[PDB]
Write a protein that binds this ligand. Structure first.
Ligand code: PNB
Ligand code: ZN
Ligand code: ZN
Ligand code: ZN
Ligand code: ZN
Ligand code: ZN
Ligand code: ZN
Ligand code: ZN
Lengths: 222, 219
């Protein structure tokens, strides 16, 4: 089982640099090209560069010469990409991929991708979120089924992790994309259950904000 | 660099019907070895991209043959013979004939389903929040279709445009519906100066606005 694991989200100050890692396993690292791709604001992909770990040979998209530097540690089967002097345009999600094109065969083997690494270039300060339980009064949806919510507001930077009943309750869950306003994000999630479950059995909102090492559970009491 | 143009930008198709996406290049993609390096990728919601086709029409392993690719020169087409729920996502064509490699802008494929009226839930500020001096009123408009909806907040009969924060989810791969959240944030003091808080929606499924509200008082 071929796998590529990328490092976590990064918050970088303007003008500084970062080194992203792409740890691979399940195949002979030195025998295939590893490519790096950039994605900005949703649909919008760009090819950055490729490296052949076996020789260390690299090819860069002109646009990125001086911006990105690719390396690869054969002893650990890890490819790295250093981004230098970060600015606005560098905020994006970066993916590494064992693309699979075999130049000699002029054919392809399966492409395997890493999960992506989100880089945020900002000088805004890290802020812990405030989690607020949303019990219904009118958001009851009468009997039959009732819907509860969880409001996570005023945090920076992304991401935040929100689960219900520690992940036990996954169906009928809606987690909305965080929205930035005045240097802080707001995110919310709703969960719909039957009148029979709540308030009879407890529903708890679990939130984690790695950047500030915040972990909080809010029980939706009536 | 080669410019890759994809059309349409978005396509809505019912499960079971065919779909086709076009990709035009600014230069012929015929390489000097006679091979044409044009690939098609699919990026499903919340997932990394995945290659579907290479060399214009060769399917990657594990890719359903419902998907077909064709074209040459500067014109290429990806066709899905019978759309299934799992086809939801953004499709991209990417060329490797000319360096540097360039991608098209993507085509979002959305599943066309029967119209669904929103299930709206409204929530007054939590005690915890009021304690901090803030007050947010939240309204969830769950599982509706089409995505096009307009929500307005009204306090004591007048529209409130300032302090509103809206968020939408992508199309759900379980029922093909959309959901949206709307939060109105005020100071605790102003919150305690008004009576009725209304979350009002305009959607295809109704000739009149869809409403949900509450009156804050005491007891
Ligand atoms: O490099 C050149 O100049 C000549 N062309 C070639 O060698 C063929 C490259 C074919 P291919 O690998 O399909 O290149 C396109 C290509 C490569 C990587 C990628 N990616 O998303 O990771 C997307 C697209
Ligand atoms: Zn051949
Ligand atoms: Zn092949
Ligand atoms: Zn060329
Ligand atoms: Zn040439
Ligand atoms: Zn008034
Ligand atoms: Zn008045
Ligand atoms: Zn008023």
């Amino acid at each position: 089982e071929m796998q590529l694991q990328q490092s976590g989200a990064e918050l970088l100050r303007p003008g500084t640099s970062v080194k992203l890692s792409c740890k691979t396993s399940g195949y002979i690292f030195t025998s295939y090209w590893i490519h790096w791709v950039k994605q900005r604001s949703g649909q919008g992909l760009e090819w950055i560069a490729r490296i052949y770990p076996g020789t260390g040979s690299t090819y860069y998209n002109e646009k990125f010469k001086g911006k990105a530097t690719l390396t690869a540690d054969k002893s650990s089967s890890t490819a790295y990409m250093q981004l230098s002097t970060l600015k606005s345009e560098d905020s994006a999600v970066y993916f590494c991929t064992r693309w699979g094109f075999i130049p000699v065969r002029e054919d392809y083997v399966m492409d395997y991708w890493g999960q992506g690494t989100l880089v945020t270039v900002s000088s805004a300060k890290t802020t812990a979120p405030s989690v607020y339980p949303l019990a219904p009064v009118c958001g009851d949806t009468t009997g039959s089924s009732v819907t509860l919510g969880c409001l996570v507001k005023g945090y920076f930077p992304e991401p935040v992790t929100l689960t219900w009943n520690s992940g036990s309750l996954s169906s009928g869950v809606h987690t909305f994309p965080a929205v930035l306003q005045s240097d802080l994000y707001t995110l919310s999630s709703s969960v719909t259950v039957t009148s029979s479950t709540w308030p009879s059995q407890s529903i708890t909102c679990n939130v984690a904000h790695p950047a500030s090492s915040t972990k909080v559970d809010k029980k939706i009491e009536p | 660099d080669i410019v890759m143009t994809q059309s349409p930008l978005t396509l809505s198709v019912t499960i079971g019907q065919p779909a086709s996406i076009s990709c035009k290049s600014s230069q012929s993609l015929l390489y000097s070895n006679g091979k044409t390096y044009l690939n098609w990728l699919l990026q499903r919601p919340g997932q990394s991209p995945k290659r579907l086709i290479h060399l214009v029409s060769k399917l990657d392993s594990g890719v359903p043959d419902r998907i077909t690719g064709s074209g040459s020169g500067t014109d290429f087409t990806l066709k899905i013979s019978r759309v299934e729920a799992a086809d939801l996502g953004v499709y991209y064509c990417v060329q490797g004939t000319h360096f540097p490699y360039t991608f098209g802008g993507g085509t979002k494929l959305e599943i066309l389903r029967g119209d669904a009226a929103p299930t709206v839930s409204i929530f007054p500020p939590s005690s915890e929040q009021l304690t901090s001096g803030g007050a947010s009123v939240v309204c969830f408009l769950n599982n509706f279709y089409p995505k096009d909806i307009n929500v307005k907040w009204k306090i004591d009969g007048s529209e409130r445009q300032n302090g509103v924060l809206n968020s939408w989810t992508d199309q759900d791969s379980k029922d093909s519906t959309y959901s949206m959240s709307s939060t109105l944030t005020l100071t605790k003091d102003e919150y305690e100066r008004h009576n009725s808080y209304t979350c009002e929606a305009t959607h295809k499924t109704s000739t009149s606005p869809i409403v949900k509200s509450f009156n804050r008082n005491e007891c």
